[PDB]
Amino acid sequence: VLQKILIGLILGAIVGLILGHYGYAHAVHTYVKPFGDLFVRLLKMLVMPIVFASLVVGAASISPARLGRVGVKIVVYYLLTSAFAVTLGIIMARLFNPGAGIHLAVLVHILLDIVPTNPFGALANGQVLPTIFFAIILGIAITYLMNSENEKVRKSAETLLDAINGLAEAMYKIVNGVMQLAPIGVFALIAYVMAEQGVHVVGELAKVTAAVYVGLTLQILLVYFVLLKIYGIDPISFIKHAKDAMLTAFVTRSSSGTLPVTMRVAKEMGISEGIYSFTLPLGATINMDGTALYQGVCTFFIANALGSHLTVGQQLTIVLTVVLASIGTAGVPGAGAIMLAMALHSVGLPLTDPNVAAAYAMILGIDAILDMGRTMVNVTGDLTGTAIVAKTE
Amino acid sequence: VLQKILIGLILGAIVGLILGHYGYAHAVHTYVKPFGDLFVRLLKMLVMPIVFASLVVGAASISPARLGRVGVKIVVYYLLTSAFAVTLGIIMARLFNPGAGIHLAVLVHILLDIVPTNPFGALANGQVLPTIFFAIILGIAITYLMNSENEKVRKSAETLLDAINGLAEAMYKIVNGVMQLAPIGVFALIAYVMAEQGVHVVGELAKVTAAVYVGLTLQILLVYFVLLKIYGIDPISFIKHAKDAMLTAFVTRSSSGTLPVTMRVAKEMGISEGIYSFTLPLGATINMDGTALYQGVCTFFIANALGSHLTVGQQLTIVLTVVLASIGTAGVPGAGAIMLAMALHSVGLPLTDPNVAAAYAMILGIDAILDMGRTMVNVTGDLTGTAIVAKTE
Amino acid sequence: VLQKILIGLILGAIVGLILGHYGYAHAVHTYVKPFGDLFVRLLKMLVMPIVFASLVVGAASISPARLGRVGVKIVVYYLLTSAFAVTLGIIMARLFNPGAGIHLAVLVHILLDIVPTNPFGALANGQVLPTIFFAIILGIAITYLMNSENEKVRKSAETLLDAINGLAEAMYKIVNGVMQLAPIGVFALIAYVMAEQGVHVVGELAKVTAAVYVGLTLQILLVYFVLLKIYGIDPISFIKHAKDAMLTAFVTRSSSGTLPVTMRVAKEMGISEGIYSFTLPLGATINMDGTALYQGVCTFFIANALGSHLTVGQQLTIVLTVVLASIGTAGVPGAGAIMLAMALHSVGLPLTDPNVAAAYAMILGIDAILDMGRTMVNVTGDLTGTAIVAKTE
Ligand SMILES: N[C@@H](CC(=O)O)C(=O)O
Ligand SMILES: N[C@@H](CC(=O)O)C(=O)O
Ligand SMILES: N[C@@H](CC(=O)O)C(=O)O
Ligand code: NA
Ligand code: NA
Ligand code: NA
Ligand code: NA
Ligand code: NA
Ligand code: NA
Ligand code: NA
Ligand code: NA
Ligand code: NA
């Protein structure tokens, strides 16, 4: 576990890069990738039940006044960590210089959709945010039945809450059983990514790869570790517990698919179920510091590859636009590169221009490698804020 | 509540009509309507769970012989109240004269679809009638397990019925919490309708508007109040309890979306859960006296605007066709005007004729204002029949 | 029951064939078929709940070591019975000679899809195999909570398992109530098939009809009865208990739709719920001996009608291809004839050839009559293997 997952990650990238330099990326896509795809299928299987069941129980166990206080805390935390990741990525884009080696030249509906019109349908087809909304309303209604003067109502409410909790506790036991297959699933996914896109990390694409990974490492040290030290949390013991969720996120490149592993990690470190069952699923789609840092670095790569000087006001409007795009990015692999296109239409750089689509295509050739570092930071920011908010209730 | 909802309804129509005469209907569509749309999203959220859970519990608590007796009673009640609404609308269409001011000239698959082939899918995508069918079969099966000679079967059946009831009782507590936002949601929806279509109530369109609302008022007095007095039910105390569901139906213009408010109203007035949990959801799609009265008035408006004399046999075939269209009309806003087109193909007036589509378009310009009075009578007829059937078990 | 279903089957085929020789097949499609379609709607209604609920309970009651042993047993049984059905059909195709009277001339994605990415969605839209996968994982997780050192976890796990079992036991009581309508539903479906396709059983099509039904009768005697005698099971008492599921399968021509009747039959004969709740739903899509025997007979009919000699190596590759097509065939009516086209592309006989499509069309004219005998053997093979595996745990 603590060694076999690291073994599969290291040995898989070695087997991936070796088989990638030869050109057998089509061979690992046939015989190796299905073992990693299966590992993701199992984790995606548990997302909707483990989110809905844990939140009905958690929103009941906690008081609505405290639950709303956690939302105000975790949202202010999410907006600040993402805004810091962009300004850290822009700084990392200027410490390095990606784009100088190549010489080219040139809402209300979303809020209302949080409220589902059919929670049975919401559970049926993904939709974590509508599920989060209905599960909170349900759990809060459950405990208002606990205070009923009627005996039949209290027994029926306790029965439903227990059955729901029985489902929740069941899903967590499945994660511990699925994570036994992680060394094989980790080995397979890291090898497929390193085989297909490991050859593409050359030259200016190797610069933007190092500019992002250094920014992500600095995001963990200068932001997450510092904030954990300020709120009195040992970072080394935190990474030891989050090691399973961080590597699973780095490997599956899906914050939504890693979500059952992160909620187990938060449970395994004693965080109240009324907090992590609400911040982790909401943070799996809103808190994306790794995506916010990646989109800030690449927007500078586009502007530098095209020989355009970005004013301080333009660098400022990039931060506000990337944070908006950081939230709109899905917790699925490759979503950040698609959302990067919307951040380029705001600075007046359309993808219809051939030189814009050229550099954008270059990023796609290494997007999955950058996607690994993105999701791990998108997920760590969810656990870091959950632990800090739970530290202050 | 008893005042704030009336305040939001009155003040909203005032703010709506004032902002409508200026032309700021696009402004209330942007800043005001989302507050009313959100109120409808919350009510639609509770429909499927509150229908399925309450009916499994209600069909278990009641005996199958009594449940089938309620169906025969409530269906005979539904067909008579709708047939009376059309003949009342045709009479109201002749007391007034809409169409003289403008001078122009010229099944088995549905029954089988009540039985769902996947109750999990039925719950996922609307389909109240298939849910009603499965919930009745489930609740009846639950109580047949209560009489099992086995102890494990009785405990497991009581466990499921309690958990289901825990969900039901939970949804009702949500309605009381959502109705706290009704004064804002009522104010928003009445203002958007009065701003967009309040300017259109001029001339012959003001005649058909008064001809319908008088017929709906007469439907409540001469039919509902009389039948409540015959079966020994004080109408004033009935309207006091149904005030929340009647105004919510008048404002949301959706019998299906108002359904969680009407089932709470029926619970708040002591009606057995084995009755209202079956008649109200079935009446939200079959009992539409307000729609049956509206389609009878408008069919005369089409024939009078085109200068065509309707024989007594034609007026008779209109009633039989509108009642058929009254049942096929959905409990969603604007469904009655779409179903009005099918009632015109039967009398030999196709919408391909330009003069037919002209008067039909005129009705669309005031359809939402008429839709408010429709749904309130469609819903009142559900509560009136439920209370009368519960008065006789 | 034991007589009325046989009465409706016999009298329905008589009324079907009589009304079919006149030509009133359109009359029985209008007034008779809806009564049979309704009977299938009710059975399809119970499939998903009775599969999911019974398997969570069954996989919990049984040990995972024994459950995996049943899978290895029932799969080896399924592959052998299907391979024997093809070799029996090819032998039956050579005892008779269909095609001499007419003189003409001329995977990994499937495995990964067993693991659902949303069990709520899987239940919503069919997908028995993903449900089987999640229900087993859930039931196994339930009993791992029974051994928890925590009291709240054991109570919540027992609560969920009971509620789920309460649903399961409920669905079985519905089957016994739906089967009371079987004599009407059986009479209707047998009459519609005999009216539409009874006229088509003439000449060479009557030969292939007798060649299949004799092979299916020999499949029950020489394979099922022999294996039941070897494992010490009285065949006469077995057919008496399976009479309801065998005739329902013969009449509805849907192994998936008959599944709630077969699981009840297996319960009514004392088979452990940890076995039949896993082998019967898995066998309703994988074990299709009647389809495997039908596709073997028809492939010879195509080759004989086109005057092509089939080598022993070709007859061998037909068996391996039909068994592959036997598994891919759905448990819905007419699926075997569609899957027969894929078995013809392997032997190098495309349906683009006019003479190939001619004989293929002839089989479609009698496909539903052959589909009756298919499903009954597809279902009997599920019960036969379940009883034999349960005989040895
Ligand atoms: N891989 C990221 C999304 C992205 O950056 O494309 C996540 O799942 O959070
Ligand atoms: N508004 C009506 C339908 C209609 O008349 O269009 C209802 O919801 O019942
Ligand atoms: N009727 C078969 C399928 C087929 O052979 O077409 C079944 O349901 O198992
Ligand atoms: Na963030
Ligand atoms: Na995230
Ligand atoms: Na995001
Ligand atoms: Na009615
Ligand atoms: Na209604
Ligand atoms: Na209707
Ligand atoms: Na088989
Ligand atoms: Na089968
Ligand atoms: Na099959």
XYZ file of C-alpha atoms and ligand atoms in Angstrom, chain A residues 74-75 77-83 219 224 283 286-289 292 326 381-382, ligand 4:
21
model
C -14.797 26.496 2.736
C -15.922 28.785 -0.104
C -10.946 29.182 1.404
C -11.613 27.844 -2.104
C -11.658 31.254 -3.788
C -8.425 32.328 -2.076
C -6.470 29.131 -2.776
C -7.442 29.241 -6.459
C -6.600 32.944 -6.765
C 1.488 25.382 -4.058
C -1.009 24.070 1.939
C -14.441 20.963 -3.601
C -15.046 24.142 -7.353
C -11.619 23.940 -5.680
C -9.125 23.293 -8.479
C -5.884 25.038 -7.557
C -6.057 27.296 -11.808
C -11.172 26.894 -12.434
C -6.730 21.555 -1.722
C -10.002 19.815 -0.871
Na -9.590 26.629 -4.518
